[PDB]
Design an enzyme around this catalytic site. Structure first.
Site, PDB file in Angstrom:
ATOM      1  N   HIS A  44      31.316 -17.285 -49.331  1.00 61.99           N
ATOM      2  CA  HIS A  44      32.718 -17.704 -49.526  1.00 61.99           C
ATOM      3  C   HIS A  44      32.952 -19.047 -50.195  1.00 61.99           C
ATOM      4  O   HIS A  44      32.072 -19.908 -50.226  1.00 61.99           O
ATOM      5  CB  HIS A  44      33.450 -17.803 -48.187  1.00 61.99           C
ATOM      6  CG  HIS A  44      32.991 -16.823 -47.165  1.00 61.99           C
ATOM      7  ND1 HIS A  44      32.309 -17.206 -46.033  1.00 61.99           N
ATOM      8  CD2 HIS A  44      33.169 -15.485 -47.072  1.00 61.99           C
ATOM      9  CE1 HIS A  44      32.095 -16.142 -45.276  1.00 61.99           C
ATOM     10  NE2 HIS A  44      32.606 -15.089 -45.884  1.00 61.99           N
ATOM     11  N   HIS A  46      34.789 -22.440 -49.865  1.00 61.56           N
ATOM     12  CA  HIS A  46      35.394 -23.232 -48.811  1.00 61.56           C
ATOM     13  C   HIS A  46      36.312 -24.254 -49.473  1.00 61.56           C
ATOM     14  O   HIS A  46      36.130 -24.601 -50.639  1.00 61.56           O
ATOM     15  CB  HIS A  46      34.313 -23.864 -47.924  1.00 61.56           C
ATOM     16  CG  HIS A  46      33.672 -22.887 -46.977  1.00 61.56           C
ATOM     17  ND1 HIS A  46      33.699 -23.043 -45.608  1.00 61.56           N
ATOM     18  CD2 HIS A  46      33.060 -21.701 -47.207  1.00 61.56           C
ATOM     19  CE1 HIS A  46      33.139 -21.991 -45.034  1.00 61.56           C
ATOM     20  NE2 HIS A  46      32.746 -21.161 -45.982  1.00 61.56           N
ATOM     21  N   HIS A  61      37.460 -21.665 -44.955  1.00 58.83           N
ATOM     22  CA  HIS A  61      37.484 -20.814 -46.136  1.00 58.83           C
ATOM     23  C   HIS A  61      38.721 -21.209 -46.924  1.00 58.83           C
ATOM     24  O   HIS A  61      39.772 -21.457 -46.334  1.00 58.83           O
ATOM     25  CB  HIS A  61      37.603 -19.336 -45.745  1.00 58.83           C
ATOM     26  CG  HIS A  61      36.405 -18.783 -45.030  1.00 58.83           C
ATOM     27  ND1 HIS A  61      36.301 -17.454 -44.685  1.00 58.83           N
ATOM     28  CD2 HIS A  61      35.264 -19.372 -44.595  1.00 58.83           C
ATOM     29  CE1 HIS A  61      35.152 -17.244 -44.070  1.00 58.83           C
ATOM     30  NE2 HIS A  61      34.503 -18.393 -44.001  1.00 58.83           N
ATOM     31  N   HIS A  69      41.299 -13.729 -42.488  1.00 57.27           N
ATOM     32  CA  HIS A  69      40.063 -13.390 -43.185  1.00 57.27           C
ATOM     33  C   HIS A  69      39.931 -11.894 -43.417  1.00 57.27           C
ATOM     34  O   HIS A  69      40.380 -11.084 -42.603  1.00 57.27           O
ATOM     35  CB  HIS A  69      38.854 -13.883 -42.387  1.00 57.27           C
ATOM     36  CG  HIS A  69      37.537 -13.531 -43.004  1.00 57.27           C
ATOM     37  ND1 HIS A  69      36.976 -14.261 -44.033  1.00 57.27           N
ATOM     38  CD2 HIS A  69      36.668 -12.527 -42.740  1.00 57.27           C
ATOM     39  CE1 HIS A  69      35.821 -13.723 -44.372  1.00 57.27           C
ATOM     40  NE2 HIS A  69      35.608 -12.667 -43.601  1.00 57.27           N
ATOM     41  N   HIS A  78      41.347 -14.296 -47.504  1.00 61.31           N
ATOM     42  CA  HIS A  78      41.471 -15.685 -47.917  1.00 61.31           C
ATOM     43  C   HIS A  78      41.105 -15.627 -49.373  1.00 61.31           C
ATOM     44  O   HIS A  78      40.346 -14.751 -49.764  1.00 61.31           O
ATOM     45  CB  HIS A  78      40.446 -16.571 -47.203  1.00 61.31           C
ATOM     46  CG  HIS A  78      40.650 -16.685 -45.720  1.00 61.31           C
ATOM     47  ND1 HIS A  78      39.594 -16.757 -44.844  1.00 61.31           N
ATOM     48  CD2 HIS A  78      41.774 -16.786 -44.969  1.00 61.31           C
ATOM     49  CE1 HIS A  78      40.054 -16.898 -43.610  1.00 61.31           C
ATOM     50  NE2 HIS A  78      41.371 -16.919 -43.660  1.00 61.31           N
ATOM     51  N   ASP A  81      37.406 -15.473 -49.922  1.00 62.76           N
ATOM     52  CA  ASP A  81      36.610 -14.385 -49.359  1.00 62.76           C
ATOM     53  C   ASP A  81      35.910 -13.483 -50.371  1.00 62.76           C
ATOM     54  O   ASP A  81      36.484 -12.513 -50.864  1.00 62.76           O
ATOM     55  CB  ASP A  81      37.481 -13.535 -48.435  1.00 62.76           C
ATOM     56  CG  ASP A  81      37.879 -14.279 -47.186  1.00 62.76           C
ATOM     57  OD1 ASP A  81      37.233 -15.305 -46.886  1.00 62.76           O
ATOM     58  OD2 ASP A  81      38.823 -13.845 -46.495  1.00 62.76           O
ATOM     59  N   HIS A 118      26.163 -17.894 -45.996  1.00 66.95           N
ATOM     60  CA  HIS A 118      25.982 -17.877 -44.550  1.00 66.95           C
ATOM     61  C   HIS A 118      24.728 -17.234 -43.941  1.00 66.95           C
ATOM     62  O   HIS A 118      24.004 -16.475 -44.584  1.00 66.95           O
ATOM     63  CB  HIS A 118      27.221 -17.242 -43.925  1.00 66.95           C
ATOM     64  CG  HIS A 118      28.444 -18.093 -44.018  1.00 66.95           C
ATOM     65  ND1 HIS A 118      28.799 -18.986 -43.033  1.00 66.95           N
ATOM     66  CD2 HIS A 118      29.387 -18.198 -44.984  1.00 66.95           C
ATOM     67  CE1 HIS A 118      29.911 -19.604 -43.384  1.00 66.95           C
ATOM     68  NE2 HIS A 118      30.289 -19.144 -44.563  1.00 66.95           N
ATOM     69  N   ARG A 141      26.269 -22.201 -41.889  1.00 69.03           N
ATOM     70  CA  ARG A 141      26.213 -22.427 -43.324  1.00 69.03           C
ATOM     71  C   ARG A 141      24.785 -22.823 -43.691  1.00 69.03           C
ATOM     72  O   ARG A 141      24.306 -23.893 -43.312  1.00 69.03           O
ATOM     73  CB  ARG A 141      27.220 -23.521 -43.682  1.00 69.03           C
ATOM     74  CG  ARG A 141      28.608 -23.199 -43.118  1.00 69.03           C
ATOM     75  CD  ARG A 141      29.672 -24.254 -43.386  1.00 69.03           C
ATOM     76  NE  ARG A 141      30.928 -23.891 -42.728  1.00 69.03           N
ATOM     77  CZ  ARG A 141      32.090 -24.509 -42.914  1.00 69.03           C
ATOM     78  NH1 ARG A 141      32.180 -25.538 -43.750  1.00 69.03           N
ATOM     79  NH2 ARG A 141      33.171 -24.094 -42.261  1.00 69.03           N
TER      80      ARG A 141
HETATM   81 CU    CU Z   1      31.962 -19.280 -45.738  1.00 71.89          CU
HETATM   82 ZN    ZN Z   2      37.666 -15.956 -45.085  1.00 69.48          ZN
END
Ligand code: CU
Ligand code: ZN
Ligand code: CU
Ligand code: ZN
Lengths: 151, 151
Positions: A44, A46, A61, A69, A78, A81, A118, A141
């Site tokens: 994602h 951020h 995010h 999400h 998001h 995403d 992730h 992360r």
């Molecule tokens: Cu993320």
């Molecule tokens: Zn998200």
């Protein structure tokens, strides 16, 4: 800018290079990530391009439209995403994504923000819990990088 | 964006965190750099936020007006020409710069670009050789970072 790039780095073995290119009203995301455990890993954008406290300072995010999400194919998601990247047995994930919501220009541009890969798979908001609709239960992360303007 | 941040890293001991804030009609640059040799070091915004080949991939100084290299107080200078930061005997340079050409949004935005601190002093384009008109003879790039949007 029509091209962007991001070098992912972390406190562990994970690293990678992500390329972004504006095409029509989409952004084509390519590249690769290495050192990952076999299987899916949340991927994602951020909110902040702040690396002062590892990947933690990148914030949540990227979500300028204040939605829950979801997966990249969902209407409710998001902006940041981008779902999951898949690593093979050797820990290499080839990134191949075309997304209509992220942009390289305008109010919801991702340039100057952070890409994060992730620990766990992103459940795409279908996990049956409140964390699923926030982070997709993607976990920690592993590596991140600030998205910059590319030649 | 009204605030930005940049974490400087390189192959050697030089590191630092640079902060940018849009105040009034200008941009205030603060922060510190450590691990430097005592004295002056060129400090500039380079065109690309590309770290794929270390600081080299950041390209030349950000120069949207196509001018020759100069000092920050000069009419003829690159937008990215922030002159010199000065390190004390302990190798610490306190960054304190206010600049009229850079910005954090629009044509002059440095978001997504790269901050670079050099091995040697920037001669502010007055060295007399061709290199001075390009880089101020500041030499190698000791550390750099992509400029990201901060909270
Ligand atoms: Cu993320
Ligand atoms: Zn998200
Ligand atoms: Cu420079
Ligand atoms: Zn210059």
């Amino acid at each position: 800018a029509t091209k962007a790039v991001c070098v992912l780095k972390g406190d562990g073995p994970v690293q990678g290079t992500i390329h972004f290119e504006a095409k029509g009203d989409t952004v084509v995301v390519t590249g690769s990530i290495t050192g990952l455990t076999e299987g899916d890993h949340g991927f994602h954008v951020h909110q902040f391009g702040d690396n002062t406290q590892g990947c933690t300072s990148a914030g949540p995010h990227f979500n300028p439209l204040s939605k829950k999400h979801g997966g990249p194919k969902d209407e409710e998601r998001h902006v940041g995403d981008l779902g999951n990247v898949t690593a093979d047995k050797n820990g290499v994930a080839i990134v191949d994504i075309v997304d209509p919501l992220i942009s390289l220009s305008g109010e919801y541009s991702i340039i100057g923000r952070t890409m994060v890969v992730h620990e766990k798979p992103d459940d795409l908001g279908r996990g049956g819990n409140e964390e699923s609709t926030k982070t997709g239960n993607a976990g920690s992360r592993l590596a991140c990088g600030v998205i910059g303007i590319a030649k």
